[PDB]
Amino acid sequence: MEVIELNKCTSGQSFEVILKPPSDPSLEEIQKKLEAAEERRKYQEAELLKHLAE
Amino acid sequence: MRECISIHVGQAGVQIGNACWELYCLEHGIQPDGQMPSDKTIGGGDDSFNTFFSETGAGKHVPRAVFVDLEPTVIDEVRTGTYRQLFHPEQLITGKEDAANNYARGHYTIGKEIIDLVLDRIRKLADQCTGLQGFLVFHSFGGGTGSGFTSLLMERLSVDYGKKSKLEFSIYPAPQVSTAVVEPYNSILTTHTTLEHSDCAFMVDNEAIYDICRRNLDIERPTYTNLNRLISQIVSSITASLRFDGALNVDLTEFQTNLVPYPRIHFPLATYAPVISAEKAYHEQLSVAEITNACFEPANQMVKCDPRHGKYMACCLLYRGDVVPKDVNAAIATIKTKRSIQFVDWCPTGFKVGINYQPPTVVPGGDLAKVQRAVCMLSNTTAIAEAWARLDHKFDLMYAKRAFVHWYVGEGMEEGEFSEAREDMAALEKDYEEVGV
Amino acid sequence: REIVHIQAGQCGNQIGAKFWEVISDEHGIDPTGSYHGDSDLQLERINVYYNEATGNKYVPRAILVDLEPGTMDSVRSGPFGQIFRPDNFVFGQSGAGNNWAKGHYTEGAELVDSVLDVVRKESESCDCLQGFQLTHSLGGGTGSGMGTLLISKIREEYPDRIMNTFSVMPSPKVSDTVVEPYNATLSVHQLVENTDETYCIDNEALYDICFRTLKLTTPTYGDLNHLVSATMSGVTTCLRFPGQLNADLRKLAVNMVPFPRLHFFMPGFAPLTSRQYRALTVPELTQQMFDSKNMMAACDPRHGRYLTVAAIFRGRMSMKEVDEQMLNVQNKNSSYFVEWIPNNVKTAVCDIPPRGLKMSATFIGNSTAIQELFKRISEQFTAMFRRKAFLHWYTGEGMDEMEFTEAESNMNDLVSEYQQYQDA
Amino acid sequence: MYTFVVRDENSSVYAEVSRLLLATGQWKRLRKDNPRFNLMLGERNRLPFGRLGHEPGLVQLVNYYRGADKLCRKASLVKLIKTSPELSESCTWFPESYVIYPTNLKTDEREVFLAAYNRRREGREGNVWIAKSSEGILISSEASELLDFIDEQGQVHVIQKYLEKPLLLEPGHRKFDIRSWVLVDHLYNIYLYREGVLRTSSEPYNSANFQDKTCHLTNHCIQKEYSKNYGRYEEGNEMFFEEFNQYLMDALNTTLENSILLQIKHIIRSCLMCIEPAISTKHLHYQSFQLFGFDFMVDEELKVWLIEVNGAPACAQKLYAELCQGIVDVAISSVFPLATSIFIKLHHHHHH
Ligand SMILES: Nc1nc2c(ncn2[C@@H]2O[C@H](COP(=O)(O)OP(=O)(O)OP(=O)(O)O)[C@@H](O)[C@H]2O)c(=O)[nH]1
Ligand SMILES: COc1cc(-c2cccc3nc(-c4cccc5c4ccn5C)[nH]c23)cc(OC)c1OC
Ligand SMILES: Nc1nc2c(ncn2[C@@H]2O[C@H](COP(=O)(O)OP(=O)(O)O)[C@@H](O)[C@H]2O)c(=O)[nH]1
Ligand SMILES: [Ca+2]
Ligand SMILES: [Cl-]
Ligand SMILES: [Mg+2]
Ligand SMILES: [Mg+2]
Secondary structure: OEEEEEEEOOOEEEEEEEEEOOOOOOHHHHHHHHHHHHHHHHHHHHHHHHHHHO | OOEEEEEEEHHHHHHHHHHHHHHHHHHHOOOOOOEOOOOOOOOOOOOHHHHOEEEOOOOEEEEOEEEEEOOOHHHHHHHOOOOOOOOOHHHEEEOOOOOOOOHHHHHHHHHHHHHHHHHHHHHHHHHOOOOEEEEEEEEEOOOHHHHHHHHHHHHHHHHHOOOOEEEEEEEEOOHHHOOOOOHHHHHHHHHHHHHHHOOEEEEEEHHHHHHHHHHHHOOOOOOHHHHHHHHHHHHHHHHHHHHOOOOOOOOHHHHHHHHOOOOOOOOOEEEEEOOOEOOOOOOOOOOHHHHHHHOOOHHHEOOOOOHHHOOEEEEEEEEEEOOOHHHHHHHHHHHHHHOOOOEOOOOOEEEEEEEEOOOOOOOOOOOEOOOOEEEEEEEEEHHHHHHHHHHHHHHHHHHOOOOOHHHHHOOOOOHHHHHHHHHHHHHHHHHHHHHHO | OOEEEEEEHHHHHHHHHHHHHHHHHHOOEOOOOOEOOOOOOOOOOHHHOEEEEOOOEEEEOEEEEEOOOHHHHHHHHOOOHHHOOHHHEEEOOOOOOOOHHHHHOOHHHHHHHHHHHHHHHHHOOOOOOOEEEEEEEOOOOHHHHHHHHHHHHHHHHOOOOEEEEEEEEOEOOEOOOOOHHHHHHHHHHHHHHHOOEEEEEEHHHHHHHHHHHOOOOOOOHHHHHHHHHHHHHHHOHHHHOOOOOOOOHHHHHHHHOOOOOOOEEEEEEEOOOOOOOOOOOHHHHHHHHOOHHHEOOOOOHHHOOEEEEEEEEEEOOOHHHHHHHHHHHHHHOHHHEOOOOOOOEEEEEEOOOOOOOOEEEEEEEEEHHHHHHHHHHHHHHHHHHOOOOOOHHHHOOOOOHHHHHHHHHHHHHHHHHHHHHHOO | OEEEEEOOOOOHHHHHHHHHHHHOOOEEEOOOOOOOOOEEEOOOOOOOHHHOOOOOOOOOEEOOOOOOHHHHOHHHHHHHHHHOOOOOOOOOOOOOEEEEOOOOOOOOOHHHHHHHHHHHHHOOOOOOEEEEEOOOOEEEOOHHHHHHHHHHOOOOEEEEEOOOOEOOEOOOOEOEEEEEEEEEOOOOOEEEEOOOEEEEOOOOOOOOOOOOOOOOOOOHHHHHOOOOOOOOOOHHHEEEHHHHHHHHHHHHOOOHHHHHHHHHHHHHHHHHHHHHHHHOOOOOOOEEOEEEEEEEEEEOOOOEEEEEEEOOOOOOOOOHHHHHHHHHHHHHOOOOOOOOOOEEEOOOOOOO
8 A cells, every 4th residue: 555646735735545556619510500599499480470370 | 826717507506606605715714895814915916715716906805706697586696695795796697587497498599698798708707817727617407507508608618718627516406406397308418518528527416415414414404505505515625626735636637637537437426524413412523534434435425326336437535624644544444445446447546635734614504513524535436327327217208208398499409409418328328337347 | 577467358357356356465465556564575576466656556467358348347346446557457348248259250359459558568567578377268258269369469479478377167067158168169279279388277176166065055156266266376376475486487387388288287276265273284285185176177187197296385384294295195196197207296385375274285287187178178069069059159250160170170189189198 | 005116027936026015905016117116126137226216205125236246147256256355265165166258258267277177187186077157068077178168159157166076865866956045135134044945866976977967967947858757756856954854864863954054054144244345235325135046065075065146046836935925024024014934044243
């Protein structure tokens, strides 16, 4: 059980104990996705208002 | 010194953010109006606490925080709160109508109308940073804002701040305190879109925190305030190494270095001990050995799961209070011979230890007693995948009938994003089982 | 936030009046709209249903609609008659003769734009309108025919707001005319298309309750409306009182409605009250509120399965005990809750109890057993329609038989939809 | 009224347990995928332990111990005994055994198996070995018969010392093994069922042709079909304890308790106490119990050897009634009370 890399300060200390050794898409793509979905919404609204107009 | 910006999204992220910043001020001796008398350098500095607070010429110490909710009731209580002076109005951002427990409404519909404003208020904080490490992101899985808007924010932060690290603190949904039947849907959806944008994520199961407050604080029905003061103790344990002198987990990159060897498996289990009622008349203070052993009881974990039936990839012990290395090592030695702790073949069997001599600070009138030593263990074990299995199963039951799906399609989401998200989760569950079995 | 309330026709205005009387008594507001209460809890959410007037007077955000003046003259003369904005009384002189066609196509069409003007004037005065609630019967002409016409127009002008109805179903046991199945079938087709949540209030059930458990031998409409206003108070509790759950119709809809057309809810109330002193225990509230005899829609819950349930407990009690009891009925009768919607039962508590009771519970169930209500209406419809009986009242207003055939088909479809998930 | 679910319909023992529970009038069975159960009688393969104990308002209990497969698969048991200090390489009651994968797939131990195999025809001693996997068995005196055989199939086998000097019952000069049923409850009490069975051979034992494997393998299946004399001496090739006891009294001047049962209890307790820290549910959010079948051999010196542990055993048909009733009493009613014990509790606290 080996204790290594011990560092001490007035606030505390740290160290490491070893028991055993080893055995992003664009802004353009995001704005497009957000507006494809906005288009799908405004389509669905238009189909409703067309249904209410009938 | 390098600054870190904290971002709180939705009800859960904002109310937990409140608890954390309350606790931070108590720990650094910062008063509700922002004055820190012990800060002898007026108007600036580059101390470790300056990672989380900035300074103004009048000596006010201002959190590097952004609060975001799509409805104003929750953040209004921040603006009228005990710590109203602490935060600058530009950092509190509200909409008028919320995401209605709907990931698609928070992501697509309402997200598009507020995202640029939020990235602008974020950039003003970043502009006051000589060196930005990245972000700590607080949110729920289950809310429409917490899930939907967060995933949108995380995508763009990758774009605007590509080399910065991003850490999550994520509230996993539990029926005992739950707000929506569709929380499994939202959880899967936000996990699928956020995965590649998160370097390290600490999951808190509201189930585990609830039962910890019932069993160990003898609170019959815990409130959000009970839950969040315990959560903020854990978060404070995890962040202390960014706010205090030390040599372990000193910047955000070390968290991925020390906790996350595989980037997709970036969900370390947190375990915290001891939790003691303030109404307990007589309490026998627990030793280094007893609290370290307690880090291997499932009843103290932030997510109930059984680490005996998984494998470890990394383990950190963060102690607070009267602890010295000799006693830690005596404690580890004994625990190794009495407990099942197996690492993956390609990792060292070992513990990274951090000690801070100041014991945990308690909130007055809180439910947590003062203790002379506490520990928070961060272990990346494959046993946490049990919570992905629970979530995915609930998702499968509803989605097999397309129950509630129409609410998402109606906001412009395509049904196929459901199955894409669910297949990503299917990959994640098997990644865990490859590593761990 | 703000909800705009509309009450149409005779039944709609009589129940709507009682509702505003009951909940204004709860919130401390007197007939002149002046506050006179104890707690500040009464007014934290007062704005969901009330506008604040000069001198901090509170006036219901309520519009009153009829095609004749009779009922609304009696509302104006009733207990809280002066609490309503006088400009919000919109009425014709013709009446609708219990005729859906007159309410929807001729007499009603003439008056409807006048109603929308008052709705618009109420909407544009709301910081953030969340939606509308309508009280009406389905068996007459104004509430049924014009009421659904208003719902169509309101959706056209506010397609992204929530539409919520309290809908009284006709019953031959409490019947004004033979054409009620016609009017109700025509109305249901509209409701399934254009509302987000409909509380199905069956005059059948209300009579049986008044008869068998309240032991009132000849129930008047007044006795029926006591049950309705008590139930309406209960279902709107979270809309009116401070709680850890917000006054949110949309979040309710999202959690109650897994499929868009299946938004017809079976309400229930406990303890069943008449115009008594013994404390009800939380175990008693819970068992009674789920009792088929406390259901306001004459459907046996054991004949279908619960998709979702919302439960609202009122009064001073152990939420630990409420939680235990709620979890108890679910685990004790897990057969009747669909297993493919996890955790489909949600409970809310509010410390403020209704007048006259120290403890009550209100039940809101989305059961597939509601199909029994629609089959019952369908069989009554078909018994007359197969002989085209009484159709001339409708064809005389421009309607064609085809429109009846379509309305009957769409309601039978709705019945099949419910049957599909009762076996899924 | 308690609730339960059945997820293994191919289970003789829990079929009867399922039926006995409803007869109480205080247990109602739910559909297989209803999650609002108190009790899960689960599947044998990939039982979803991670979904248990997260239903508020329900104490939940399952009829299997997560992790108990380490005992109940031949390769793992070998691995477990050698590697654990509480079993140790120095373990007097397990036949010498070795893990060997086919070369189709390549740790493996066939290197160290050779090392002892050679001191065995060096040293003159009987070098007969068995080979089997978790149907397909081989008993040969020369190793390449063994390793050849396992190359031929695709799964990992174990080579184990074949006990060349077994105890033979007379009349018959015939082999047998002993099966013992063990119930571990949620409290990790270890219960031995008072009744075991001897699975006898119908064939006289023969140490010259290890190829006709019906006097060599005591299995109930291999005996009713491929054997001349199935049922000659004992009904169903099943000798029970009262008879086997009186035989030991008449023929060998001993009892079953002294000569054999103390060893059996010592073995059961040592195995289960070894794995207890790894499988115990004492502070878990759900709870476990499990029925085990331990299989033993007895050599001529009356020394007991453990051959394997079965994690999903069937019972002897005469014994289902009493044993399954026992399971309900101490493993189920233990947790969910309804409105002369057939078990011996295995407990020993020697101080040193
Ligand atoms: N621990 C904890 N969990 C919370 C808190 N607030 C909400 N939650 C959990 O978060 C989930 C609901 O998400 P919210 O954050 O409330 O919803 P939201 O992000 O505001 O999004 P909206 O749908 O627009 O309201 C549920 O699982 C709640 O139990 C909190 O203060 N503390
Ligand atoms: C339950 O009572 C009510 C609840 C709510 C309400 C308000 C905000 C978030 C909510 N999340 C749920 C909820 C969560 C989980 C399951 C649920 C519901 C509802 C039915 N199930 C199966 N409910 C909410 C609003 C109400 O009025 C508008 C109301 O009164 C009927
Ligand atoms: N519960 C209840 N039902 C009513 C009341 N008044 C009328 N009804 C029922 O409503 C239907 C008649 O509709 P009504 O409102 O009188 O006609 P409208 O004026 O054209 O809308 C019949 O089914 C009546 O039984 C009432 O005060 N309470
Ligand atoms: Ca300074
Ligand atoms: Cl960058
Ligand atoms: Mg919110
Ligand atoms: Mg009338």
